């Protein structure tokens, strides 16, 4: 019966709530209240990259920390050298509503997607030296929001149809599909060992997924509106989420509950992107009021501002050696801070 | 050296190509088409066009007096539209199609218009409004079986204005109903506030020929206002 199932769900949620309540013997703030603050943190722009004709929706650094890829709503995908500001490649697309990028960890492939519900895969190292489309992955029923390589032959995607999928490139068909969300899936993040990943999905919840066997292990709540960005702490045992209610939060995978909140009274606008630092001591977030804020991740205090853009900040990233930070926004410019 | 100069040469060739493509990008006008199930946006497409399953978006191209228009129509998505609409904030205009003869779903269209007018990322974009299927409305009004004031009680006291300019020979009842229905939209287009964007309403039928010319004229006015706000004359 429907009513008995609803009652049982309520009882199970009550038991889960009490079990989580038994574990809150302290808080992050009472313990870390004897740590010296990092101090004022100040950064300035070393490079400005010009050439896109419209908004910028995505970027992603290479694993050597020198090359990067970016996508615009002109209909182009550009690959840049960032020590000299030379252009290495400029690839034109079949559809101009592109919304994501990824760069393979080997350096041989790039991928993109958007409002055409298809994931396109481009080979960079061919015998003639030409970039031509290698693959077109089809089967979703809503726009593609994010995608990330695991290796040269496997990839993971999230769409606006409430699912996630794992694809095998050579054969061309899905191998596993992950279901359970109710609304659009907005962001996606991989674990350092690539055995687990987390998804944030525009219904105020986040989920932890097991790649090989294929079930949802844990579900995290606590926001009050949609979730736009997510990432992993370098340790691998925590993650951070940014919402449309003007708040960032920090969640732990072994205590199974919220751990920290970062918000301020003057900030009443949403969050577009989130990322961490190499040691994990700084958290960087980009906002809809055109600038980025730098937060202390163990004490929740604003310790810096990055302010050089004249429109909505849309993407943000940090290299694998920790040297630079890249930001891009709706005004067509990318900037590199150090 | 012997490599850095080659890198500079390659970057120069890429820049040449981008400078070639900029000219074509900045010379075409882009339009977004919105409608509903009972509206006739498909016949608008099928009339001005000649002039992979699970696909997310369709496009059509046409050209009037040597100006090029690209029109986009969304295909296979879901109902919720508050996330993929944000990526349409740079278009020249939004063409909004309404079915004007049904009386049961006009309030839903009014709510849609209110949401599109007042959104944060769509405040500078003008709307061209097509009130479709005039012949069905005229027949239904002449029938006398369904009353408008069962859905809009204010129609009980409305009277057609003394300064109006009707069509040559139309029965006054049809004129009164048409003027009332158009008023309903221009109110939410004047009470909204601001005053940067404008709405251009037309009445069209199921068999017509002049819609491309109308789009042409409205886009001319939009561009002139933009050029008047770009040269610091306001």
């Amino acid at each position: 019966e429907l009513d008995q199932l609803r009652q049982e769900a309520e009882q199970l949620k009550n038991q889960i709530r009490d079990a989580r309540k038994a574990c809150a013997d302290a808080t992050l703030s009472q313990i870390t209240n004897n740590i010296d603050p990092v101090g004022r943190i100040q950064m300035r722009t070393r490079r400005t990259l010009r050439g896109h004709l419209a908004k910028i929706y995505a970027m992603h650094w290479g694993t050597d920390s020198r090359l990067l890829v970016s996508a615009s709503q002109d209909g182009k995908l550009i690959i840049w050298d960032s020590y000299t500001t030379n252009k290495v490649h400029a690839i034109p697309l079949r559809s101009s509503w592109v919304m994501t990028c990824a760069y393979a960890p080997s350096g041989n492939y790039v991928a993109c997607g958007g409002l055409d519900n298809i994931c396109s895969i481009y080979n960079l190292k061919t015998r003639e030296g030409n970039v031509r489309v290698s693959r077109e992955l089809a089967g979703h029923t809503g726009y593609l929001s994010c995608c990330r390589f695991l290796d040269d032959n496997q990839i993971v995607t999230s769409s606006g149809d409430t699912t996630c999928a794992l694809w095998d490139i050579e054969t061309g068909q899905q191998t596993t599909t992950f279901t359970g969300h109710t609304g659009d899936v907005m962001s996606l993040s991989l674990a350092p060992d690539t055995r687990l990943f987390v998804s944030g999905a525009c219904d105020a919840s986040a989920k932890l997924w097991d790649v090989r066997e294929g079930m949802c292990r844990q579900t995290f709540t606590g926001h009050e509106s949609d979730i736009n960005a997510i990432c992993f702490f370098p340790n691998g045992n925590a993650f951070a989420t940014g919402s449309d209610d003007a708040t960032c939060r920090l969640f732990d995978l072994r205590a199974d509950q919220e751990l920290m909140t970062y918000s301020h009274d003057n900030i009443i606008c949403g969050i577009t992107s989130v990322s961490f630092s190499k040691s994990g001591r700084l958290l960087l977030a980009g906002y809809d009021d055109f600038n980025c804020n730098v937060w202390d991740a163990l004490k929740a205090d604003r310790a810096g501002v990055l302010a050089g853009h004249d429109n909505r900040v849309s993407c943000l990233g940090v290299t694998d050696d920790g040297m630079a930070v890249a930001t891009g926004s709706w005004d067509s410019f990318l900037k590199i801070w150090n | 050296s012997a490599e850095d100069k080659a890198a500079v040469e390659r970057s120069k060739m890429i820049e040449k190509q981008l400078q070639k493509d900029k000219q074509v990008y900045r010379r075409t006008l882009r339009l977004l088409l919105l409608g509903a199930d009972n509206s006739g946006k498909s016949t608008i497409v099928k009339q001005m066009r000649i002039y992979v399953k699970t696909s997310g978006i369709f496009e059509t191209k046409f050209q009037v007096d040597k100006v090029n228009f690209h029109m986009f129509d969304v295909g296979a998505q879901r109902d919720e539209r508050r996330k993929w609409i944000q990526c349409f904030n740079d278009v020249t205009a939004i063409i909004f199609v309404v079915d004007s003869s049904d009386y049961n779903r006009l309030q839903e269209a009014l709510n849609d218009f209110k949401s599109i007018w007042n959104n944060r990322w769509l405040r500078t974009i003008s709307v061209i409004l097509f009130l479709n299927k005039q012949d069905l409305l005229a027949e239904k009004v002449l029938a006398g079986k369904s009353k408008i004031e069962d859905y809009f009680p204010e129609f009980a006291r409305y009277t057609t204005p003394e300064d109006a300019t009707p069509e040559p020979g139309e029965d006054p009842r049809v004129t009164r109903a048409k003027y009332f229905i158009r008023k309903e939209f221009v109110d939410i287009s004047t009470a909204s506030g601001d005053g940067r964007h404008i709405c251009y309403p037309h009445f069209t039928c199921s068999v017509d020929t002049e819609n491309a010319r109308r789009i042409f004229n409205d886009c001319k006015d939009i561009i002139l206002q933009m050029n008047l706000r770009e040269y610091n004359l306001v």
Epitope: T182, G183, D203, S225, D226, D244, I268 | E80, R82, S115
Partner: nanobody, 128 residues
């Protein structure tokens, strides 16, 4: 956990009166604009009325003006609807809906595709 619980409902004879109420939990109630929607047998979701952040602006649909009234109580986080002079065409299920984001003035929330911030509903029958 965004939760919205409706109360009220039942069966009345034509011309009767009812009061529906909704209690909200899991967000800051006073930052949001609120709506009432309903669904009828054989129909889809229809929009009934809405109220603003403080109560200064109120709006109704053309078929209920003069009969239905809407109100907030921000100290108790409750939303109220008073229904008078009920007609047989008012038998339906009623839901309370919340806007997606705070501090805004537009809505996207009659979708059948499982809008997330909405309650389960309550039954209103007007027959004799």
């Amino acid at each position: 956990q965004v939760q919205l619980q409706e109360s009220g409902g039942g069966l009345v004879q034509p011309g009767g009166s009812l009061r529906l109420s909704c209690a909200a939990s899991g967000f800051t109630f006073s930052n949001y604009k609120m709506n009432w929607v309903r669904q009828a047998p054989g129909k889809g979701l229809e929009w009934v009325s809405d109220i603003s952040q403080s109560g200064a602006s109120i709006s109704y649909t053309g078929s209920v003006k003069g009969r239905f009234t809407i109100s907030r109580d921000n100290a108790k986080n409750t939303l109220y609807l008073q229904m008078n002079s009920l007609k047989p065409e008012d038998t339906a299920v009623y839901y309370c809906a919340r806007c997606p984001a705070p501090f805004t003035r537009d809505c996207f929330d009659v979708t059948s595709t499982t809008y997330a911030y909405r309650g389960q509903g309550t039954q209103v029958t007007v027959s004799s």
